PDB file of C-alpha atoms in Angstrom:
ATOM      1  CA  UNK M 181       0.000   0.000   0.000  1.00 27.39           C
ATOM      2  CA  UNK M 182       1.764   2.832  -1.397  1.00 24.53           C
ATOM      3  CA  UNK M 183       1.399   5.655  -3.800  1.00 26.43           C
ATOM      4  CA  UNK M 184       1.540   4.108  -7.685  1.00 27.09           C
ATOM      5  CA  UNK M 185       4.295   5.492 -10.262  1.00 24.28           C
ATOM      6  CA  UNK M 186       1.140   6.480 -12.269  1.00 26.47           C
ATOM      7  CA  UNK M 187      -0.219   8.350  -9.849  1.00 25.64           C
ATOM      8  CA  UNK M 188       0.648  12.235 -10.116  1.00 23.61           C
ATOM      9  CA  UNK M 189       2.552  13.422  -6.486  1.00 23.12           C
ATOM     10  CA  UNK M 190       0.014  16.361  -5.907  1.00 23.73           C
ATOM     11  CA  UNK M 191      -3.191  14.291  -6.857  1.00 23.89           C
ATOM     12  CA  UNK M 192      -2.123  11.645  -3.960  1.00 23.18           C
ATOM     13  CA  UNK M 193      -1.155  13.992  -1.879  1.00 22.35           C
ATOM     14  CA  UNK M 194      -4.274  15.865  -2.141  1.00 22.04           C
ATOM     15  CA  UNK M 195      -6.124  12.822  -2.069  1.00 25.62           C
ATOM     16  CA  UNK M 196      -5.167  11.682   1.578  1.00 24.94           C
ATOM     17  CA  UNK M 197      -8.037  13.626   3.844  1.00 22.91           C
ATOM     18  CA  UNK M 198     -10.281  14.182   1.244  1.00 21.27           C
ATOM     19  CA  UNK M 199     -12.187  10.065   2.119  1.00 19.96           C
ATOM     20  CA  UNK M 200     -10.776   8.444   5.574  1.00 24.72           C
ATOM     21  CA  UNK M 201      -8.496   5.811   3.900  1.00 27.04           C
ATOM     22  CA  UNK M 202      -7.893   3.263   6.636  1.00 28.92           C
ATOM     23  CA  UNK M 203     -11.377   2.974   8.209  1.00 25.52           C
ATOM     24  CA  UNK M 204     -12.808   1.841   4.561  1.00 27.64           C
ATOM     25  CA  UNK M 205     -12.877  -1.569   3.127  1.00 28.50           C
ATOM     26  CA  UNK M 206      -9.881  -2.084   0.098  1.00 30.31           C
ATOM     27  CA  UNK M 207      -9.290   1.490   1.593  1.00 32.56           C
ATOM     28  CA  UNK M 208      -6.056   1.828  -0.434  1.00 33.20           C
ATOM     29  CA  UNK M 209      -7.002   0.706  -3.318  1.00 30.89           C
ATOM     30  CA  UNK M 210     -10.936   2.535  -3.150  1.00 29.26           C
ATOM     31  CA  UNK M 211      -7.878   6.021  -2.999  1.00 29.18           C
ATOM     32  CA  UNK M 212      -5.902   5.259  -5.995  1.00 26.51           C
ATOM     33  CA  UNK M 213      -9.680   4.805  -8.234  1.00 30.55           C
ATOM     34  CA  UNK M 214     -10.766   7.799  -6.667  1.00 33.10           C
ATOM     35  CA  UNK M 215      -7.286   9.102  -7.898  1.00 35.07           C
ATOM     36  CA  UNK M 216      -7.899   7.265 -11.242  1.00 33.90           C
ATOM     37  CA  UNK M 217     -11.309   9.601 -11.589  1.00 33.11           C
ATOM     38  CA  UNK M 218      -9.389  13.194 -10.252  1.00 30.26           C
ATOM     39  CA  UNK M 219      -6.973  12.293 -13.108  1.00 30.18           C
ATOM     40  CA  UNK M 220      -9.040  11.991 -15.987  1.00 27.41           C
ATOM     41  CA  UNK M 221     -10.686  15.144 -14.778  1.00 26.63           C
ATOM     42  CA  UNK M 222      -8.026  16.552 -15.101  1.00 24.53           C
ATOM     43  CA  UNK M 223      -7.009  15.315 -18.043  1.00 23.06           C
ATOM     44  CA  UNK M 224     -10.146  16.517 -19.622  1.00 27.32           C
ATOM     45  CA  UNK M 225      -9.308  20.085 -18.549  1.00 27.63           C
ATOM     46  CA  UNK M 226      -6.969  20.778 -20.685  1.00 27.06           C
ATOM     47  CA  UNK M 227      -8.774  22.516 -23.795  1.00 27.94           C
ATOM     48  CA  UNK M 228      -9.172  26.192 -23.418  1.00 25.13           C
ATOM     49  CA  UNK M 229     -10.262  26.820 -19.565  1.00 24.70           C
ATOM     50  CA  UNK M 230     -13.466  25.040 -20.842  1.00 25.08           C
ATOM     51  CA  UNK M 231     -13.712  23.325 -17.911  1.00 28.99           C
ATOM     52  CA  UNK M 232     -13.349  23.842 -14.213  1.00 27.28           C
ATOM     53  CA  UNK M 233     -12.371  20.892 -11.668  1.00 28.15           C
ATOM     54  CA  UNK M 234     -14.600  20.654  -8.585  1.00 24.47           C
ATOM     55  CA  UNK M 235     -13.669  17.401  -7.027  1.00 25.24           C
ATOM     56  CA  UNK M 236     -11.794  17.418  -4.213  1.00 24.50           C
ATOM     57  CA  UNK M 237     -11.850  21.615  -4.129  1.00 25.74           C
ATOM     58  CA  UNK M 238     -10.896  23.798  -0.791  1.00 25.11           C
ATOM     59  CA  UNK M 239     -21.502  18.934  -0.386  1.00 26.98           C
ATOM     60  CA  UNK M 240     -23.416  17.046  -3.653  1.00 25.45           C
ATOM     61  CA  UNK M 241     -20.681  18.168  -6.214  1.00 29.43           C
ATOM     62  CA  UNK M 242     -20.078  17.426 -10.153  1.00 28.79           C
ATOM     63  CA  UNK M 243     -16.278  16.142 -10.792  1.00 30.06           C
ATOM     64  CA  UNK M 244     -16.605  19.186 -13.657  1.00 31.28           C
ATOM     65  CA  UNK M 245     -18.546  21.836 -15.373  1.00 34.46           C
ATOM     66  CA  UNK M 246     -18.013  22.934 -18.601  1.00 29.38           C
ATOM     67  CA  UNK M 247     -17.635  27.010 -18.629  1.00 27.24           C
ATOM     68  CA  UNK M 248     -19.205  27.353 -22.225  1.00 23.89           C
ATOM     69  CA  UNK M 249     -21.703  25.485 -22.980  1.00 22.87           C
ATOM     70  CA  UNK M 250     -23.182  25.404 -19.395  1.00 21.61           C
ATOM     71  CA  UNK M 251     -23.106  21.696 -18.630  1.00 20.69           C
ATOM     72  CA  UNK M 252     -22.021  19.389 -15.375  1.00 17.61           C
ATOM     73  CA  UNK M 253     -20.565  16.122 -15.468  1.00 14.82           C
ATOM     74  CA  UNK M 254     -19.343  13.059 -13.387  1.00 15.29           C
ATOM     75  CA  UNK M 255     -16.951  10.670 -14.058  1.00 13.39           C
ATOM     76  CA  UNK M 256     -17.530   6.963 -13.579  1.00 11.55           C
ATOM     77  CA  UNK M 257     -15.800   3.609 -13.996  1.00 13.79           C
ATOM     78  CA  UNK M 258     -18.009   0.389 -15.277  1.00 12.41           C
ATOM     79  CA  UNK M 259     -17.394  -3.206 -16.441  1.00 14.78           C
ATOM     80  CA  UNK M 260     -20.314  -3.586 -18.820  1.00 14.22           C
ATOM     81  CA  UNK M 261     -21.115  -0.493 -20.990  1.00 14.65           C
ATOM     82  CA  UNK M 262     -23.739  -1.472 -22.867  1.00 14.85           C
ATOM     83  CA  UNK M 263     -25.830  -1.966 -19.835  1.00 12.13           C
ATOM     84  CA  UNK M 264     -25.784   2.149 -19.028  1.00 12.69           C
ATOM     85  CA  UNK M 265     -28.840   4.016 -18.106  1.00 11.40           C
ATOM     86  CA  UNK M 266     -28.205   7.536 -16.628  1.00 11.54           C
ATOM     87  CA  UNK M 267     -27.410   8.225 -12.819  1.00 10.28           C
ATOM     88  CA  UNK M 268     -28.668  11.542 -12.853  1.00 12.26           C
ATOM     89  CA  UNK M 269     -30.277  14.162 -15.365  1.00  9.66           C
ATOM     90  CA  UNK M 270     -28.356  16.696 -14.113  1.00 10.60           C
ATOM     91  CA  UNK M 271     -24.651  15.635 -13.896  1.00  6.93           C
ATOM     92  CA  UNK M 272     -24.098  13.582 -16.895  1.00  6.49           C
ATOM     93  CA  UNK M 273     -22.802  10.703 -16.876  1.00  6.35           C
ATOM     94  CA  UNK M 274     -18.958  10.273 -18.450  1.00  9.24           C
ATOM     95  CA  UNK M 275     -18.327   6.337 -17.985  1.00  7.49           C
ATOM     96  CA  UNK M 276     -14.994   4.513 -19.427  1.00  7.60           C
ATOM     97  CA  UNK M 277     -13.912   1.385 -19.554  1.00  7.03           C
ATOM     98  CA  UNK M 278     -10.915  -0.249 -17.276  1.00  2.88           C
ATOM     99  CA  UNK M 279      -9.831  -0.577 -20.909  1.00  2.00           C
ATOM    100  CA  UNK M 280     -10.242   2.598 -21.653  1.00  4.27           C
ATOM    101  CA  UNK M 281     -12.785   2.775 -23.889  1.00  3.90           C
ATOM    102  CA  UNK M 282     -15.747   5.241 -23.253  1.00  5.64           C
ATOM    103  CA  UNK M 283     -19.785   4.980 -23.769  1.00  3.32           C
ATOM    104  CA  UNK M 284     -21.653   6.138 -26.564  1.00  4.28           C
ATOM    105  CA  UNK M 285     -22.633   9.394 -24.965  1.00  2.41           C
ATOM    106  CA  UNK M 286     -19.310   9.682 -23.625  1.00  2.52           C
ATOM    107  CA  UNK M 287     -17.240   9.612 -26.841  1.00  2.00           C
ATOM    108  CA  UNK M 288     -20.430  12.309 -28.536  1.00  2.00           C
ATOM    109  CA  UNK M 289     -18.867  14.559 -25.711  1.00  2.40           C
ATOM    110  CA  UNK M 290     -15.220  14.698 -25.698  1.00  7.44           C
ATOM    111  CA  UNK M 291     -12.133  15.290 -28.686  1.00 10.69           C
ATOM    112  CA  UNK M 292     -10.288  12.455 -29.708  1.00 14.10           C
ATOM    113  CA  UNK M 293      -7.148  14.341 -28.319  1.00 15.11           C
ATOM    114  CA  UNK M 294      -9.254  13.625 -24.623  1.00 16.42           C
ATOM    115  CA  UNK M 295     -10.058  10.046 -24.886  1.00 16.23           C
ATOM    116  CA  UNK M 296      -6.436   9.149 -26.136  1.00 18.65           C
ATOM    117  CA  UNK M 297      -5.070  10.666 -23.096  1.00 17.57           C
ATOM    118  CA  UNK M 298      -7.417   8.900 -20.974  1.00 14.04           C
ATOM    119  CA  UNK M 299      -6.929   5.278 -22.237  1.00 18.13           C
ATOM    120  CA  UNK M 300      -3.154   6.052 -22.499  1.00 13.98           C
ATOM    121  CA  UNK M 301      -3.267   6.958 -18.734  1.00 12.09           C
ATOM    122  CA  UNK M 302      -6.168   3.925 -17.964  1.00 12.34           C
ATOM    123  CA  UNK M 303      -4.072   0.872 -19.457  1.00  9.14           C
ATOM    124  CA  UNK M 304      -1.129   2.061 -17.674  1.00  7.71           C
ATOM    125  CA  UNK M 305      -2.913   1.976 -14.082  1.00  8.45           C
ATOM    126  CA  UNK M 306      -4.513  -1.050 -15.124  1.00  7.90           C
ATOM    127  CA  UNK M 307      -1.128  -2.469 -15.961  1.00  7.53           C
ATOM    128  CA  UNK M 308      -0.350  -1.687 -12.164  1.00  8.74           C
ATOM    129  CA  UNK M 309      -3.466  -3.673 -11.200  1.00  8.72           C
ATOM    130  CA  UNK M 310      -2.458  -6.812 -13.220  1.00 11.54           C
ATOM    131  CA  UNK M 311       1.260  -6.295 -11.695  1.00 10.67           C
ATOM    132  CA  UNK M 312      -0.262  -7.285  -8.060  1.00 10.46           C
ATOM    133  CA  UNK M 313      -3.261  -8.973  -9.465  1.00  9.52           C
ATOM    134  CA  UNK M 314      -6.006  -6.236  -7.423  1.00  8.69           C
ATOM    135  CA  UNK M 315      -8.553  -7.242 -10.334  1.00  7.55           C
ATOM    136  CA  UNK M 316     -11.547  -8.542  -8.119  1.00 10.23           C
ATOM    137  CA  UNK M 317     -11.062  -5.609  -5.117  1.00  5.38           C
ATOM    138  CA  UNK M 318     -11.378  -3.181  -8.255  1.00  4.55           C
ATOM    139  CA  UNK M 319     -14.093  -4.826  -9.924  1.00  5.71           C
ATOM    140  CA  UNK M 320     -16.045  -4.960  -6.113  1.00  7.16           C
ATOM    141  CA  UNK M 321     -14.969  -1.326  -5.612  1.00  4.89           C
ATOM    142  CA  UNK M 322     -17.028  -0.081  -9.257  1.00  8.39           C
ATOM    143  CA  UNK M 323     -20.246  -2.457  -7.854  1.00  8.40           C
TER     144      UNK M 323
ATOM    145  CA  UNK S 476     -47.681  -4.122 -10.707  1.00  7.38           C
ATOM    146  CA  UNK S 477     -45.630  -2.005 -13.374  1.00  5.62           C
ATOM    147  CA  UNK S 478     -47.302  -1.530 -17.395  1.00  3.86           C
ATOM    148  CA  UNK S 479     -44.923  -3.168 -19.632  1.00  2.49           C
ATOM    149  CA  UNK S 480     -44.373  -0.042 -21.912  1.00  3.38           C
ATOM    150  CA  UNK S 481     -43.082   1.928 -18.596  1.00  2.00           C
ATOM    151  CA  UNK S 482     -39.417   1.408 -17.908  1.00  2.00           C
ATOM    152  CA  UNK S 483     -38.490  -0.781 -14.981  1.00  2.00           C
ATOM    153  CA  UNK S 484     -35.754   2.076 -13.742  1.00  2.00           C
ATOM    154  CA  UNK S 485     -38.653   4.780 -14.424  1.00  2.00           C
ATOM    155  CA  UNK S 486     -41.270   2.867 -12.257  1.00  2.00           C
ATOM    156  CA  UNK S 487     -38.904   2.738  -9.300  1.00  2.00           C
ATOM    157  CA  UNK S 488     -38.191   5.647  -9.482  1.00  2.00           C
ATOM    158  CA  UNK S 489     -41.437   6.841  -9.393  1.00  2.00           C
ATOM    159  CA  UNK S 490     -42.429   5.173  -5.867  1.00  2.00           C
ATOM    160  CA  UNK S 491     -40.766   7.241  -3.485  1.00  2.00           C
ATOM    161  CA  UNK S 492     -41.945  10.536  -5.351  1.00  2.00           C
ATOM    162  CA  UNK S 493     -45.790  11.110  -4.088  1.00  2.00           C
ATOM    163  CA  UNK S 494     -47.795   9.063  -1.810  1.00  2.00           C
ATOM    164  CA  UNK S 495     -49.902   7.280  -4.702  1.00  2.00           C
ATOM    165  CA  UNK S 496     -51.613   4.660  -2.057  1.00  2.00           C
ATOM    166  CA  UNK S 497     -53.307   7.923  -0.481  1.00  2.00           C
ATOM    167  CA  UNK S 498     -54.876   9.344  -3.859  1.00  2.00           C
ATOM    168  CA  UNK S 499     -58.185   7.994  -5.622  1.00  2.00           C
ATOM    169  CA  UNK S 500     -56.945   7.247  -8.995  1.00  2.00           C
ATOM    170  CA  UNK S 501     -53.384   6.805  -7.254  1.00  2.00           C
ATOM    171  CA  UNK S 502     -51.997   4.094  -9.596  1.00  2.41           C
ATOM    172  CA  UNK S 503     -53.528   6.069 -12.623  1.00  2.00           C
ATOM    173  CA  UNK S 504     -51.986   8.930 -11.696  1.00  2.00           C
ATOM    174  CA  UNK S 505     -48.392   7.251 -11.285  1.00  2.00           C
ATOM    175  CA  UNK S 506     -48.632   6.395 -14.723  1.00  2.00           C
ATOM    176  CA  UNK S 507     -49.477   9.344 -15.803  1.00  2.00           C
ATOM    177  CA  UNK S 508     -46.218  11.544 -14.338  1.00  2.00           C
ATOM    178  CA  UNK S 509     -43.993   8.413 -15.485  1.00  2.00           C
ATOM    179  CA  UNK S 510     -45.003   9.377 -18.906  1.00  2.00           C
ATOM    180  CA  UNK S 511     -44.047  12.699 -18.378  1.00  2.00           C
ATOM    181  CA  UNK S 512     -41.216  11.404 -17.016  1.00  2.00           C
ATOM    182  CA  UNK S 513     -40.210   8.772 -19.471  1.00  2.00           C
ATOM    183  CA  UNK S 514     -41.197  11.900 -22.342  1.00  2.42           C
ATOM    184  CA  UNK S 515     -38.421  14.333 -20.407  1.00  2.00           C
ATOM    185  CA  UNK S 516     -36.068  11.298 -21.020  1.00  2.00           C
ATOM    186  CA  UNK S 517     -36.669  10.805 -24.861  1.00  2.00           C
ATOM    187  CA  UNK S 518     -36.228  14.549 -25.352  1.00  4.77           C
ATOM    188  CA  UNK S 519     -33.046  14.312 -23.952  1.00  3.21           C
ATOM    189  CA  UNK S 520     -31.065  12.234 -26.084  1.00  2.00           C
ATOM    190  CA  UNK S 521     -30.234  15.300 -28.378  1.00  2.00           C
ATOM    191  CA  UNK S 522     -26.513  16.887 -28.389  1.00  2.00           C
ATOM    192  CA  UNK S 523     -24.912  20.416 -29.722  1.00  4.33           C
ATOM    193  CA  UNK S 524     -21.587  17.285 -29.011  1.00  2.00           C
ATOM    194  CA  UNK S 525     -22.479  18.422 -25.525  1.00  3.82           C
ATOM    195  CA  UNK S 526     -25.925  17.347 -23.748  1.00  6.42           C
ATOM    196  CA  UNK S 527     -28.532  20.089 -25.142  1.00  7.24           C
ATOM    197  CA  UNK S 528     -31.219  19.471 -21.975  1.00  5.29           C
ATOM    198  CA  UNK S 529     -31.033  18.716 -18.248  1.00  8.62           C
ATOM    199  CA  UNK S 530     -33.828  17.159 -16.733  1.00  9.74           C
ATOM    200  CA  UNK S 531     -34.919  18.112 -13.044  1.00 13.50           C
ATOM    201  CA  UNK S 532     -37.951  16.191 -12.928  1.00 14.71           C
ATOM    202  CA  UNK S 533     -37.330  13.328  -9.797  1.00 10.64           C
ATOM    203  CA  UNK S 534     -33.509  14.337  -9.067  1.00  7.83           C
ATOM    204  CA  UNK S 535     -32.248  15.107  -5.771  1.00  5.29           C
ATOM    205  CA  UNK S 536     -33.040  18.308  -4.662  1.00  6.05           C
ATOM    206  CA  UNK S 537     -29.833  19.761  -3.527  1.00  6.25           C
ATOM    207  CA  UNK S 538     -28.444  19.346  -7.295  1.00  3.64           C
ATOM    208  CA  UNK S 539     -31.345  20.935  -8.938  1.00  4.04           C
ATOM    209  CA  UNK S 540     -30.390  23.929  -6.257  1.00  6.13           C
ATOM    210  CA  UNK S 541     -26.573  23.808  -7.110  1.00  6.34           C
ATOM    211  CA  UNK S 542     -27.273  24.149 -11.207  1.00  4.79           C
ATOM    212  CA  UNK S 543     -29.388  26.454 -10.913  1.00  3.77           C
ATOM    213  CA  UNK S 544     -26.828  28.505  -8.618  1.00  4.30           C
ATOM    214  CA  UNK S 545     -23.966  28.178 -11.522  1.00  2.63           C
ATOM    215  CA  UNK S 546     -26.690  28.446 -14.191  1.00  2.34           C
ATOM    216  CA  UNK S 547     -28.128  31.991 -12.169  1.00  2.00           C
ATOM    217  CA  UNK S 548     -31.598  30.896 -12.352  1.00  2.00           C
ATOM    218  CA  UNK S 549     -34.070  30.229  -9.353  1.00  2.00           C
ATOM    219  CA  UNK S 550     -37.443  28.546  -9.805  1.00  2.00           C
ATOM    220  CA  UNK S 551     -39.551  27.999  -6.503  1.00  2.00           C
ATOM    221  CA  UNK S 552     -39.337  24.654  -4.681  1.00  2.00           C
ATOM    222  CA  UNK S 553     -43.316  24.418  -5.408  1.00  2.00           C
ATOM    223  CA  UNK S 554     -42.807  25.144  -8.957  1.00  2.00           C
ATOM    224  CA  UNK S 555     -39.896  23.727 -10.717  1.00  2.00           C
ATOM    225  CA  UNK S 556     -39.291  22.345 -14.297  1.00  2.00           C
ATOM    226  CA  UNK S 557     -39.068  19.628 -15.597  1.00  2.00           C
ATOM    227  CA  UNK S 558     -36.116  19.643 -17.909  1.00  2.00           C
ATOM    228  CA  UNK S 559     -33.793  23.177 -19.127  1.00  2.00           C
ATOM    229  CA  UNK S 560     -32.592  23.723 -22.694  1.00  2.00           C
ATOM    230  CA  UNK S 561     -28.844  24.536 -21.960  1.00  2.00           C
ATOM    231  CA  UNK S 562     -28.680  26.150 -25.532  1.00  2.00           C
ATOM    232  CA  UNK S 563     -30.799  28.746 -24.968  1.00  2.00           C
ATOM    233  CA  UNK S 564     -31.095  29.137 -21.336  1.00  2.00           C
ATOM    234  CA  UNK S 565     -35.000  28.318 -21.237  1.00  2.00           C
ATOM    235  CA  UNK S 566     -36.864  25.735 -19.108  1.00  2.00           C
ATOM    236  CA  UNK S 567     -39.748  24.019 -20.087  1.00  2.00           C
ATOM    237  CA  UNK S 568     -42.832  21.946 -18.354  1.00  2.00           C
ATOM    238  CA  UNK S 569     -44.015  18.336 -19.717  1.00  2.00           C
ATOM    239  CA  UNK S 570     -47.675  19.176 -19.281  1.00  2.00           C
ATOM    240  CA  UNK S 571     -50.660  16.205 -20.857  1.00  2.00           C
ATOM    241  CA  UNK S 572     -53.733  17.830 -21.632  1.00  2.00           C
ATOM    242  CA  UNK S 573     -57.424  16.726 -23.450  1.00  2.00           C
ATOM    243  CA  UNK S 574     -57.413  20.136 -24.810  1.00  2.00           C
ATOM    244  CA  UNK S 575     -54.630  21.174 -26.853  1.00  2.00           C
ATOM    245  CA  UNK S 576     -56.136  23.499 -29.206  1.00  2.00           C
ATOM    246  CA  UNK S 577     -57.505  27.072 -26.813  1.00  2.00           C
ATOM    247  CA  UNK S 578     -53.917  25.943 -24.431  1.00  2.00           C
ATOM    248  CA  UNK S 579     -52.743  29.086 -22.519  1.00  2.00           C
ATOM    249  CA  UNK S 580     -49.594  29.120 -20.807  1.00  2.00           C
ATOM    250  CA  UNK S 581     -49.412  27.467 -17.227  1.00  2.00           C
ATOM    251  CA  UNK S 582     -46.585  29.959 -16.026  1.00  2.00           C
ATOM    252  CA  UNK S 583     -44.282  32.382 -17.088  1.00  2.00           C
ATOM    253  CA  UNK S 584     -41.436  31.010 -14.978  1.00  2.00           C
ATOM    254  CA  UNK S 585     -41.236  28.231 -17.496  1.00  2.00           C
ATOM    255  CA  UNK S 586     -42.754  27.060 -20.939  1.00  2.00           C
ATOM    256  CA  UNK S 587     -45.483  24.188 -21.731  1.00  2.00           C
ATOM    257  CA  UNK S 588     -44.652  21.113 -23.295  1.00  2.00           C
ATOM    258  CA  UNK S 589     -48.159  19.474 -24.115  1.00  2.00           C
ATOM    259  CA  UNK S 590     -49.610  16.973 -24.836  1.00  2.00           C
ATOM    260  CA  UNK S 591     -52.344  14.918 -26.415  1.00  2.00           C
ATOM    261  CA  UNK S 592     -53.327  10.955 -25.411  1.00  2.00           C
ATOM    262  CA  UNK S 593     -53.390  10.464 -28.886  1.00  2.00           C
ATOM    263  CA  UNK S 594     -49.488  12.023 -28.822  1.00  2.00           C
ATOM    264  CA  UNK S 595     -50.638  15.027 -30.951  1.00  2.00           C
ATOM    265  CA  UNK S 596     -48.280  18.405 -29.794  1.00  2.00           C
ATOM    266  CA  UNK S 597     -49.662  21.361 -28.364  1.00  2.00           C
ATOM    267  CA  UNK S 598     -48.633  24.430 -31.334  1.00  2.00           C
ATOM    268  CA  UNK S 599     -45.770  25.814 -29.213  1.00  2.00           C
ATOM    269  CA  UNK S 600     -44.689  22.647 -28.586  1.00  2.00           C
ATOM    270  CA  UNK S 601     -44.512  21.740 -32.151  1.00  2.00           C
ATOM    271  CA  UNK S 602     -42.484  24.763 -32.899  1.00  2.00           C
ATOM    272  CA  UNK S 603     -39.523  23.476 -30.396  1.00  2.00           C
ATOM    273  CA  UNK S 604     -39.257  19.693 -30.605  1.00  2.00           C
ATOM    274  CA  UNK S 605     -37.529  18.314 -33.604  1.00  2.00           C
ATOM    275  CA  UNK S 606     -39.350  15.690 -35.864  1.00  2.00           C
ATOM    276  CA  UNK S 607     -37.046  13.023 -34.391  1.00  2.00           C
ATOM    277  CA  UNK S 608     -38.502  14.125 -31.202  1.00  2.00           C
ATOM    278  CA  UNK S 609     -41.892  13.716 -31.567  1.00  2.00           C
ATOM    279  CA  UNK S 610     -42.046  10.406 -33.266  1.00  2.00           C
ATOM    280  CA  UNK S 611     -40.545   8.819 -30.306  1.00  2.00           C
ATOM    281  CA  UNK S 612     -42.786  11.201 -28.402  1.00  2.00           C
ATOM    282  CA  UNK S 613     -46.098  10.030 -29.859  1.00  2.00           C
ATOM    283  CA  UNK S 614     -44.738   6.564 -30.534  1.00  2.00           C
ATOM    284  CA  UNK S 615     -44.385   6.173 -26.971  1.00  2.00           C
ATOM    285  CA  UNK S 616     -48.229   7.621 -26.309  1.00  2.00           C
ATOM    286  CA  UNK S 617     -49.368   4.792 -29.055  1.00  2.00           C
ATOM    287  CA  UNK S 618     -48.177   2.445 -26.834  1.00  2.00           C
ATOM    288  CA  UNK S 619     -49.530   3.947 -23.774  1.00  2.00           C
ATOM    289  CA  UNK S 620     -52.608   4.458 -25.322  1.00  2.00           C
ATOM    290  CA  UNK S 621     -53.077   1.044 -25.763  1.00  2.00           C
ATOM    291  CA  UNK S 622     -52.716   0.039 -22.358  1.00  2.00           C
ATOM    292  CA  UNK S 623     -55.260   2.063 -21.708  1.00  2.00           C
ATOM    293  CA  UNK S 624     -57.981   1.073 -23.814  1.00  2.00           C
ATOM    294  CA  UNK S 625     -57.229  -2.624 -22.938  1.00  2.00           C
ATOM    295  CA  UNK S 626     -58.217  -1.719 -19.258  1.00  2.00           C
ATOM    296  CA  UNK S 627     -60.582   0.104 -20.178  1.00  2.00           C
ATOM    297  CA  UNK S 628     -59.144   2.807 -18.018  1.00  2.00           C
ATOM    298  CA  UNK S 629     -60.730   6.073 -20.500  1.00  2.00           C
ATOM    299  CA  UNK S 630     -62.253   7.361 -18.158  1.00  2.00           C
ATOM    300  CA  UNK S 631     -60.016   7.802 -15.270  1.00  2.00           C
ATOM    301  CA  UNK S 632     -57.417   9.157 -17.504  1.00  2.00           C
ATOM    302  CA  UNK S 633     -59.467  11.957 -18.460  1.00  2.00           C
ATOM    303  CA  UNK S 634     -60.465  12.743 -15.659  1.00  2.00           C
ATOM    304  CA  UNK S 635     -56.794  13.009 -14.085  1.00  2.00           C
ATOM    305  CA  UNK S 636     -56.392  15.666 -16.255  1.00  2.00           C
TER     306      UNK S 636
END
């Protein structure tokens, strides 16, 4: 139980009181997908800023908003993506893959130049998965 | 207990909403906002890419109240739409009515969205869906219409309106 390589320094170090780690069940590993999630937002943040960050700021958040066109999403993890129905008709839903791939209304959303980031950074965390085999206490955790 | 042509997801939702056991005409009128409901849903679907409508209709409350806070836009606990157009800043109200032809507007908070049994749309509501809107619209009302007339529930449904 330490931080990843493919975790960024600041994200884990943010991350630390933001849930109360220990108390939780696969409370390590529950931190790193939470840290997967801050990541991609971030990741997706990068056009210009279109879109502002509010997980883990400074209580019933989005992850982001989108400055220009008015719109709040969350970002979720699933196994099967074909069976999808919405969460909430407010913050919309933007689910991936542990693959990396992303849902049908995910990919109408964001730019190719997004989604390549995103599966670029999910294949290399799930490469740290498979390297101490945390498949099933990751699977559990997206239940 | 659930009509076939409602969604599973959209009937559960609906049981925790209003106290249906307590009405006359309690299950009818379940039905009835789940097809409002289910209508806010198949508007919906429509993009820009981003997601052109938000619906409020059912969600949590304190999200409704944090949208509206970025969005600057208040609508009263009592009276609050059902989904909001994020292209043009406009909300809207799925409203079924017998009477679509004399309709006059139910606020001016909000527009109408209405609605025949028959799926027919109400002029102004014409004038805002898309054709690939209403289809699904009044293909959905077909359907619901039928599962009326086979329990031979007419009546009631007028009525509740």
């Amino acid at each position: 139980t330490d931080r990843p390589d493919h975790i960024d320094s600041r994200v884990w170090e943010l991350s630390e009181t933001q849930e109360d780690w220990i108390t939780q069940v696969h409370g390590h590993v529950r931190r790193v997908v939470e840290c997967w999630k801050y990541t991609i937002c971030c990741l997706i943040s990068n056009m210009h800023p279109q879109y502002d960050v509010f997980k883990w700021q400074d209580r019933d958040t989005p992850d982001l908003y989108d400055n220009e066109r008015a719109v709040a999403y969350k970002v979720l993890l699933v196994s099967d993506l074909s069976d999808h129905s919405p969460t909430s008709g407010i913050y919309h839903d933007l689910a991936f893959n542990l693959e990396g791939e992303a849902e049908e209304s995910c990919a109408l959303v964001l730019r190719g130049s997004q989604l390549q980031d995103i599966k670029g950074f999910l294949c290399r965390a799930l490469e740290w998965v498979v390297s101490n085999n945390l498949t099933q206490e990751v699977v559990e955790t997206i239940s």
